[PDB]
Design a binder for this molecule. Structure first.
Ligand SMILES: OC[C@H]1O[C@H](O[C@H]2[C@H](O)[C@@H](O)[C@@H](O)O[C@@H]2CO)[C@H](O)[C@@H](O)[C@@H]1O
Length: 404
């Protein structure tokens, strides 16, 4: 009978790939359907380039793809419209914001699978050791805490210890980090939902200059090459006071044999001042059935299973990744394992999207301009002032003649 082949999450990021392969294999066993799992590279933009090869070929060799929240406008032609397969009641069990994200020109490109938001990880033991009673609310406070804690830990003999790790590699994750910096300084959304390219302003320039000021100081020089896992591994070994990352790192840090089990908490990222907006970049993944699948019925059944309450529950409990079903945020077991899902739910609700809606199918080009200009600041090659000016010019060229 058919073999349903899934290009799923990466085994190179935490447990996400191993876990998803397990869920796909469980579906195959429950239904008596043969399955195969196709692994992916860690970085989202590398995944996009890989899947674009299959889509260009109209390849039947993948039935289901796990797609980024930033991709529906890019990937829609390659998606089977799921709308005819779900009832209105079924579709209302997911967050409407994500269903809307996934719907392009009325086509439901994909089912919401897990959501994501950038958050601040902090070492509670170290804050207490150095006389701090709360995590930092402003970036200045973050820098002050990091300077003091680093000085003390270095003096105590940990030469591997840093104050802050984050994603500074030139790839999509830096666009995500940089949206948080810029928005939390009151510098806007880079490209606003209305189409205005707003990034050439002094608050956005300051945000980028501030992040440059971290590199080689409170953050490793090598942060300019870090994606999610590089930052996590410094943090997880016990060697960073603070980390900016996504929800998946929490469960990994709590695993038996983690050096930092029981030593950390999470909160909203800091901001420039009390009246700036809180910033958490909206991430997350969706489940798409290929327009090129020879087995759409079976593929749809697998995607519904993966997006189901029980599978999302397992993702939450075991991998600390955020459900797309509001009902799971009140589930007793989800909450007992991850009480911060409740504490941070307003952060998740107010997360700021990258400019994928407005850029549509040109989003990857826009994002490449963003991360490259941002990276030039982090390396000390350009000042923020010049970079936001250059970035404006680039995005103007990229989006010229694009309408949304
Ligand atoms: O790097 C930007 C990318 O980060 C997040 O995606 C991660 C996800 O958190 C992990 O659990 C795992 O699935 O790997 C993904 C790719 O590194 C965001 O979800 C995504 O929106 C964002 O583009």
């Amino acid at each position: 009978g058919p073999v349903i082949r899934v290009a799923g999450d990466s085994t190179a990021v935490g447990e996400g790939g191993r876990w998803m392969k397990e869920m796909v294999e469980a579906w195959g066993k429950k239904t008596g359907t043969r399955v195969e799992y196709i692994d992916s590279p860690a970085d989202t933009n590398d995944r996009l380039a890989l899947y674009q090869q299959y889509w260009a070929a109209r390849s039947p060799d993948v039935d289901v793809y796990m797609i980024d929240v930033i991709w529906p406008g890019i990937v829609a032609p390659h998606a089977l419209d799921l709308k005819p397969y779900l009832t209105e009641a079924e579709l209302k069990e997911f967050f409407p914001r994500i269903v809307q994200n996934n719907t392009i020109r009325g086509k439901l490109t994909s089912l919401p699978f897990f959501t994501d938001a950038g958050i601040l990880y902090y070492r509670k033991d170290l804050l207490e050791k150095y006389g701090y009673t709360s995590p930092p609310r402003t970036w200045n406070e973050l820098e002050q805490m990091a300077e003091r804690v680093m000085e003390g830990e270095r003096r105590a003999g940990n030469r591997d210890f840093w104050g802050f790790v984050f994603q500074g590699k030139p790839y999509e994750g830096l666009t995500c980090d940089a949206l948080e910096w810029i928005y939390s300084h009151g510098g806007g959304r880079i490209v606003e939902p209305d189409g205005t390219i707003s990034v050439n302003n002094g608050r956005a320039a300051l945000a980028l200059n501030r992040a440059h000021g971290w590199v080689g100081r409170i953050a490793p020089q090598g942060v300019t090459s870090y994606a999610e896992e590089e930052a996590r591994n410094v943090w997880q070994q016990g060697n960073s006071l603070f980390m900016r990352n996504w929800p998946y790192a929490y469960a990994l840090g709590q695993a038996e044999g983690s050096p930092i089990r029981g030593k950390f908490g999470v909160t909203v990222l800091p901001k420039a001042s009390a009246d700036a907006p809180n910033a958490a970049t909206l991430g997350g993944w969706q489940l798409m059935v290929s327009a090129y699948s020879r087995y759409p019925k079976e593929a749809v059944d697998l995607v519904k299973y993966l997006a189901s309450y029980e599978v999302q529950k397992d993702n939450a409990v075991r991998l600390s990744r955020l459900p797309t079903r509001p009902a799971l945020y009140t589930d007793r077991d989800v909450l007992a394992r991850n009480p911060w899902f409740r504490d941070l739910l307003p952060v998740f609700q107010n997360a700021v999207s990258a400019p994928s809606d407005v850029a549509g199918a040109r989003y990857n080009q826009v994002s490449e301009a963003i991360w490259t200009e941002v990276h030039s600041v982090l390396t000390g090659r350009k000042k923020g002032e010049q970079a936001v000016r250059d970035l404006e010019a680039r995005i103007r060229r990229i989006l010229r003649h694009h309408h949304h």
